Amino acid sequence: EWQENKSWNAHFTEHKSQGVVVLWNENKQQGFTNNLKRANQAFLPASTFKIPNSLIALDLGVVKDEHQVFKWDGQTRDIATWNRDHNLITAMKYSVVPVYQEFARQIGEARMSKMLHAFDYGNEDISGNVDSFWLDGGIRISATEQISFLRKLYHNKLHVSERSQRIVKQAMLTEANGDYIIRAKTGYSTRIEPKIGWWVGWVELDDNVWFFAMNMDMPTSDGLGLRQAITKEVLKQEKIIP
Amino acid sequence: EWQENKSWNAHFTEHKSQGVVVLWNENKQQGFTNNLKRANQAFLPASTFKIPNSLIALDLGVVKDEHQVFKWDGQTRDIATWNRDHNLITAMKYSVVPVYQEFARQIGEARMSKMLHAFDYGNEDISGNVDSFWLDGGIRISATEQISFLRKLYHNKLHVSERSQRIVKQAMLTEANGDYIIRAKTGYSTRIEPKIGWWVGWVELDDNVWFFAMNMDMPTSDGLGLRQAITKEVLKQEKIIP
Ligand SMILES: O=C(O)c1cccc(-c2ccncc2)c1
Numbered sequence: 494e495w496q497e498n499k500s501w502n503a504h505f506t507e508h509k510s511q512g513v514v515v516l517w518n519e520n521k522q523q524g525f526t527n528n529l530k531r532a533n534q535a536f537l538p539a540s541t542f543k544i545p546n547s548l549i550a551l552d553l554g555v556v557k558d559e560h561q562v563f564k565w566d567g568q569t570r571d572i573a574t575w576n577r578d579h580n581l582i583t584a585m586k587y588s589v590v591p592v593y594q595e596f597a598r599q600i601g602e603a604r605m606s607k608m609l610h611a612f613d614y615g616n617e618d619i620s621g622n623v624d625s626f627w628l629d630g631g632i633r634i635s636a637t638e639q640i641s642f643l644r645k646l647y648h649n650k651l652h653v654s655e656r657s658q659r660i661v662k663q664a665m666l667t668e669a670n671g672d673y674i675i676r677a678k679t680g681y682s683t684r685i686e687p688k689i690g691w692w693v694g695w696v697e698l699d700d701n702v703w704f705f706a707m708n709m710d711m712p713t714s715d716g717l718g719l720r721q722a723i724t725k726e727v728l729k730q731e732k733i734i735p
Numbered sequence: 736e737w738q739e740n741k742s743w744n745a746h747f748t749e750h751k752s753q754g755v756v757v758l759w760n761e762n763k764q765q766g767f768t769n770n771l772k773r774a775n776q777a778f779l780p781a782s783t784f785k786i787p788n789s790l791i792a793l794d795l796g797v798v799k800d801e802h803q804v805f806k807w808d809g810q811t812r813d814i815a816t817w818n819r820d821h822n823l824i825t826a827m828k829y830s831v832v833p834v835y836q837e838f839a840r841q842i843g844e845a846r847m848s849k850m851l852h853a854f855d856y857g858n859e860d861i862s863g864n865v866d867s868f869w870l871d872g873g874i875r876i877s878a879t880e881q882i883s884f885l886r887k888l889y890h891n892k893l894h895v896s897e898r899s900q901r902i903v904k905q906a907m908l909t910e911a912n913g914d915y916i917i918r919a920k921t922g923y924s925t926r927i928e929p930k931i932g933w934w935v936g937w938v939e940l941d942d943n944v945w946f947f948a949m950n951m952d953m954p955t956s957d958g959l960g961l962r963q964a965i966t967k968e969v970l971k972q973e974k975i976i977p
């Protein structure tokens with residue numbers, strides 16, 4: 494079941510923003526959120542779509558392994574980190590859109606659609622440009638649906654090879670220490686309203702795993718750092734991390 | 736290719752200790768150490784042997800995956816974390832000797848011997864008790880030999896399944912942030928003189944990989960923390976980590 498905790502809103506109001514945090518206790522099979530309605534509100538996935546995109550590219554051979562180099566095309570873009578060669582790890586670390594756009598082109602409209610249906614991903618609607626539908630197309634997904642999708646990935650239950658799912662889980666590595674491990678992916682939807690920021694993944698503990706998925710209104714890029722900051726303060730309140 | 740940098744000794748002396756640090760730049764294929772002799776002096780692997788031990792156990796089916804639970808045998812031991820159920824992740828995280836002793840028993844002398852030779856691991860001598868040879872048996876490995884093994888693990892070139900190697904590298908995960916990822920294994924040898932502590936692994940960067948292997952005199956358990964502190968103080972000096 495699910496369960497609402499309005500107290501987390503204090504973290505959002507503390508930063509003069511508003512959004513939703515959704516946690517899932519794998520052991521107890523229980524979910525927690527500050528806003529059950531927005532937890533089920535479907536938004537554009539934006540760069541969080543790089544998870545299923547990576548899975549499909551790997552399983553089809555578009556990506557050989559996490560070391561394959563995808564050379565810069567030479568176009569100077571507003572994000573400096575995008576103007577250099579990348580591999581799967583760095584491409585996901587820096588949310589390099591142009592690399593995954595090339596993945597989607599080679600994947601193809603048809604194969605992308607078939608796989609997202611097998612993943613049961615959001616509304617499964619890729620309408621728009623094959624190389625930007627997750628940014629300005631018709632695909633939509635809610636926070637609870639992210640967790641459902643993420644859970645399949647953790648258990649290697651998605652309909653792709655185990656290898657592909659392990660590699661993507663490796664590429665999602667964000668932070669790790671003696672207390673926890675975080676495998677997650679950021680997102681920043683700016684092309685179509687509402688402008689929001691994503692952060693979806695999970696926290697690995699010794700004896701349990703806490704899946705999470707959060708989105709928040711992001712009218713300007715200054716507040717991107719709040720995606721992780723607000724998430725972590727909820728984790729510290731729930732005593733999941735020191 | 737190899738170069739000696741006696742300046743690093745300052746990090747050992749300010750802590751009233753002695754030891755060796757060995758670095759290998761994968762891109763440039765160059766190695767650096769503070770003591771060429773000790774870098775090639777072979778010691779007992781101790782708990783660093785849990786890398787090859789895990790690889791063999793996985794490849795033979797002794798360990799099904801990183802989720803298989805290994806039940807505490809109900810015998811109280813002086814290490815609190817050992818009086819607990821474990822999987823490969825927590826077992827390696829907490830150096831749970833009893834769990835790996837059962838691995839070796841199930842693996843068997845013959846298969847254990849055969850595999851270590853394929854790995855070209857240390858002196859490849861499993862002489863002693865199958866359930867403790869890496870602690871008070873005849874097997875020996877030097878810091879430089881550890882790196883040659885670690886490098887084969889990183890490139891999946893060892894004579895075991897790719898999956899087995901990916902799993903162990905996941906279990907080796909120790910620390911991660913926006914600047915680097917560390918996958919390593921600690922060691923603490925006390926049954927045969929000299930008493931030492933190990934730390935072998937590597938640092939993953941965006942554009943390079945730094946392999947490392949260090950051991951230091953450990954007369955008492957009070958200085959175990961210096962294994963990581965000293966190693967990191969060298970990494971900062973070589974500007975491998977901020
Ligand atoms: O957080 C993300 O996922 C993401 C993706 C693409 C671009 C940017 C971005 C845009 C402007 N200034 C800073 C960062 C962020």
Ligand SMILES: O=C(O)c1cccc(-c2ccncc2)c1
Nearest residue numbers: 782829830832921922923956959
């Ligand atoms: O650091 C390790 O890898 C390790 C492995 C096994 C045991 C111990 C140990 C033994 C006594 N007191 C404290 C710790 C340490």
Ligand SMILES: [Cl-]
Nearest residue numbers: 663666905908
């Ligand atoms: Cl990993």
